[PDB]
Design a protein around this ligand. Sequence first.
Ligand SMILES: *[C@@H]1O[C@H](CO)[C@@H](O[C@@H]2O[C@H](CO)[C@@H](O[C@@H]3O[C@H](CO[C@H]4O[C@H](CO)[C@@H](O)[C@H](O)[C@@H]4O)[C@@H](O)[C@H](O[C@H]4O[C@H](CO)[C@@H](O)[C@H](O)[C@@H]4O)[C@@H]3O)[C@H](O)[C@H]2NC(C)=O)[C@H](O)[C@H]1NC(C)=O
Ligand SMILES: *[C@@H]1O[C@H](CO)[C@@H](O[C@@H]2O[C@H](CO)[C@@H](O[C@@H]3O[C@H](CO[C@H]4O[C@H](CO)[C@@H](O)[C@H](O)[C@@H]4O)[C@@H](O)[C@H](O[C@H]4O[C@H](CO)[C@@H](O)[C@H](O)[C@@H]4O)[C@@H]3O)[C@H](O)[C@H]2NC(C)=O)[C@H](O)[C@H]1NC(C)=O
Ligand SMILES: *[C@@H]1O[C@H](CO)[C@@H](O[C@@H]2O[C@H](CO)[C@@H](O[C@@H]3O[C@H](CO[C@H]4O[C@H](CO)[C@@H](O)[C@H](O)[C@@H]4O)[C@@H](O)[C@H](O[C@H]4O[C@H](CO)[C@@H](O)[C@H](O)[C@@H]4O)[C@@H]3O)[C@H](O)[C@H]2NC(C)=O)[C@H](O)[C@H]1NC(C)=O
Ligand SMILES: *[C@@H]1O[C@H](CO)[C@@H](O[C@@H]2O[C@H](CO)[C@@H](O[C@@H]3O[C@H](CO[C@H]4O[C@H](CO)[C@@H](O)[C@H](O)[C@@H]4O)[C@@H](O)[C@H](O[C@H]4O[C@H](CO)[C@@H](O)[C@H](O)[C@@H]4O)[C@@H]3O)[C@H](O)[C@H]2NC(C)=O)[C@H](O)[C@H]1NC(C)=O
Ligand SMILES: *[C@@H]1O[C@H](CO)[C@@H](O)[C@H](O)[C@H]1NC(C)=O
Ligand SMILES: *[C@@H]1O[C@H](CO)[C@@H](O)[C@H](O)[C@H]1NC(C)=O
Ligand SMILES: *[C@@H]1O[C@H](CO)[C@@H](O)[C@H](O)[C@H]1NC(C)=O
Ligand SMILES: *[C@@H]1O[C@H](CO)[C@@H](O)[C@H](O)[C@H]1NC(C)=O
Lengths: 173, 58, 58, 55
Amino acid sequence: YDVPDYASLRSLVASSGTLEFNNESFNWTGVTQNGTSSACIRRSNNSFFSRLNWLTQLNFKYPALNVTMPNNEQFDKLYIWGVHHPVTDKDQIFLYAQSSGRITVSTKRSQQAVIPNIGYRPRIRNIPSRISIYWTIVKPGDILLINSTGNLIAPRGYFKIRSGKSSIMRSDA
Amino acid sequence: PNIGYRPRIRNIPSRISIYWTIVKPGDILLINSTGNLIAPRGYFKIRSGKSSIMRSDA
Amino acid sequence: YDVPDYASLRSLVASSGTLEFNNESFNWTGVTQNGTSSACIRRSNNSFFSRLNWLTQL
Amino acid sequence: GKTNEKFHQIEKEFSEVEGRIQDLEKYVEDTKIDLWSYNAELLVALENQHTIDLT
Ligand SMILES: *[C@@H]1O[C@H](CO)[C@@H](O[C@@H]2O[C@H](CO)[C@@H](O[C@@H]3O[C@H](CO[C@H]4O[C@H](CO)[C@@H](O)[C@H](O)[C@@H]4O)[C@@H](O)[C@H](O[C@H]4O[C@H](CO)[C@@H](O)[C@H](O)[C@@H]4O)[C@@H]3O)[C@H](O)[C@H]2NC(C)=O)[C@H](O)[C@H]1NC(C)=O
Ligand SMILES: *[C@@H]1O[C@H](CO)[C@@H](O[C@@H]2O[C@H](CO)[C@@H](O[C@@H]3O[C@H](CO[C@H]4O[C@H](CO)[C@@H](O)[C@H](O)[C@@H]4O)[C@@H](O)[C@H](O[C@H]4O[C@H](CO)[C@@H](O)[C@H](O)[C@@H]4O)[C@@H]3O)[C@H](O)[C@H]2NC(C)=O)[C@H](O)[C@H]1NC(C)=O
Ligand SMILES: *[C@@H]1O[C@H](CO)[C@@H](O[C@@H]2O[C@H](CO)[C@@H](O[C@@H]3O[C@H](CO[C@H]4O[C@H](CO)[C@@H](O)[C@H](O)[C@@H]4O)[C@@H](O)[C@H](O[C@H]4O[C@H](CO)[C@@H](O)[C@H](O)[C@@H]4O)[C@@H]3O)[C@H](O)[C@H]2NC(C)=O)[C@H](O)[C@H]1NC(C)=O
Ligand SMILES: *[C@@H]1O[C@H](CO)[C@@H](O[C@@H]2O[C@H](CO)[C@@H](O[C@@H]3O[C@H](CO[C@H]4O[C@H](CO)[C@@H](O)[C@H](O)[C@@H]4O)[C@@H](O)[C@H](O[C@H]4O[C@H](CO)[C@@H](O)[C@H](O)[C@@H]4O)[C@@H]3O)[C@H](O)[C@H]2NC(C)=O)[C@H](O)[C@H]1NC(C)=O
Ligand SMILES: *[C@@H]1O[C@H](CO)[C@@H](O)[C@H](O)[C@H]1NC(C)=O
Ligand SMILES: *[C@@H]1O[C@H](CO)[C@@H](O)[C@H](O)[C@H]1NC(C)=O
Ligand SMILES: *[C@@H]1O[C@H](CO)[C@@H](O)[C@H](O)[C@H]1NC(C)=O
Ligand SMILES: *[C@@H]1O[C@H](CO)[C@@H](O)[C@H](O)[C@H]1NC(C)=O
């Protein structure tokens, strides 16, 4: 993976001091969820990140995903989603069945539009692809709308965020 | 432009992104587009002074 | 609307402290200017931002 | 009556949480406030020491 803004995500998560992950039931229809990879082994089995969801074509089809998730609670939500960049046009057609993907995650106050960039990268653990990870903060009363047509690493739920005295440290003591 | 859906505000699901351009004296502003352009109507005069902005309810 | 850099535009405009808008005659040919919207009402009529211009096909 | 005037400064209070830039502005403002708070304590305590001594 490769976070485009590593220091920004590392600061607000460390300042919250909590990882209370709550699962939310989305409506991913027409796609195959729970995609696994051979470079991320869990209990001698192929697995992925536990807080993300890899979406893959179903019966050589991939309908456009228009799934909303309103925030009716009284605290801010931190959604962690990702964009997967393939290596070749053959792998893009094999995985998402569309030669040009696009991901749009928008709220009432902000919008994020990330287009995948197919290309080669240096191999890490015999994998030449990369994943870019973005975060979205949803206010109370705001509505999270996720629209994409491929190459989307869907989130599994929201991360609770608060303000406290927590911080981060780099030491070997 | 990025075509896509957004949450509806005042029964409108579209968005407008706003950018600013500063033109120096002697510089030439060239605007080229083929669609989805919100054209400006004129320039805004800008100077340097003691002005500022403030958020209060007094 | 949605400004990609809200704090940058809000800072330089407030530091200037003036809004002397001057109209400039452009050359928008082949398009229909003065596009209006139903979500921005002015004097019980459909209108838009007074400092912008919406371009639509002709 | 020996004050100094400042017109335009950075934003010192924030509503939406941001990344590195918002953390830097909250640290520059906190550095100036704590340094001037110590300078006010040292100036008053030094002047009070001399005023009692001369009296
Ligand atoms: C565009 O340019 C890039 C350069 O960045 C090329 O990327 C290289 O591609 C080659 C071949 O595809 C890669 O080589 C592969 O490396 C894998 C990892 O190597 C480690 O593991 C092996 C053991 O498996 C060790 O021996 C090795 O020392 C490393 O520790 C290997 O697993 C691959 O093995 C394959 O070939 C061998 C024969 O040599 C077979 O026996 C295997 O079964 C398997 O098929 C392979 O060697 C290389 O790592 C890539 N990166 C770099 C930086 O070079 C792109 O390939 C190129 N584009 C095109 C279209 O060619
Ligand atoms: C945000 O979320 C929305 C909601 O899903 C998405 O909207 C869908 O986008 C997909 C994009 O692929 C649309 O699928 C395409 O629809 C086209 C519309 O054609 C219909 O209408 C015409 C009349 O205008 C009829 O004549 C025609 O028969 C259809 O009934 C199709 O033309 C497209 O066809 C393409 O795919 C087929 C394979 O299925 C190829 O054979 C074709 O050659 C062609 O390449 C395609 O089916 C879908 O219709 C949209 N839904 C709605 C409700 O509008 C947004 O895309 C999404 N935004 C983003 C950025 O992802
Ligand atoms: C992809 O996913 C997004 C989710 O973000 C969908 O967006 C929603 O779309 C629906 C329908 O298109 C929207 O619902 C509409 O809301 C409008 C505003 O609602 C306010 O005003 C009405 C009074 O007009 C109040 O009753 C209401 O409480 C709100 O205060 C309504 O004006 C619309 O009314 C239409 O339907 C009714 C019947 O229910 C008719 O009587 C009307 O004449 C009119 O035709 C409508 O209800 C909704 O707001 C959108 N956003 C969200 C966050 O849900 C996209 O539609 C979806 N893409 C596709 C292709 O489906
Ligand atoms: C910056 O500003 C410049 C100045 O206007 C813009 O340049 C124009 O760009 C448009 C883009 O659409 C050009 O329009 C296209 O011109 C093509 C050139 O074809 C001519 O030349 C060939 C020989 O090379 C002749 O054989 C042919 O008959 C033409 O005389 C056309 O092929 C295009 O056709 C497309 O549209 C028609 C519908 O009108 C379709 O039927 C076609 O299938 C095809 O899709 C089109 O007409 C225009 O020519 C450019 N002008 C100049 C002077 O170069 C830049 O685009 C602009 N930059 C940006 C980023 O906006
Ligand atoms: C999921 O989306 C499909 C769209 O075809 C819709 O029919 C279905 O009711 C949705 N399910 C839920 C739980 O929203
Ligand atoms: C995906 O896996 C999770 C747990 O790993 C499970 O709760 C969920 O039902 C699975 N979904 C599908 C479609 O298999
Ligand atoms: C506007 O552009 C057209 C291009 O067709 C040109 O003929 C005309 O002279 C221009 N008008 C002005 C005022 O520059
Ligand atoms: C657009 O409106 C302005 C004032 O609202 C007017 O001066 C201008 O002539 C109009 N242009 C067109 C093409 O109608």
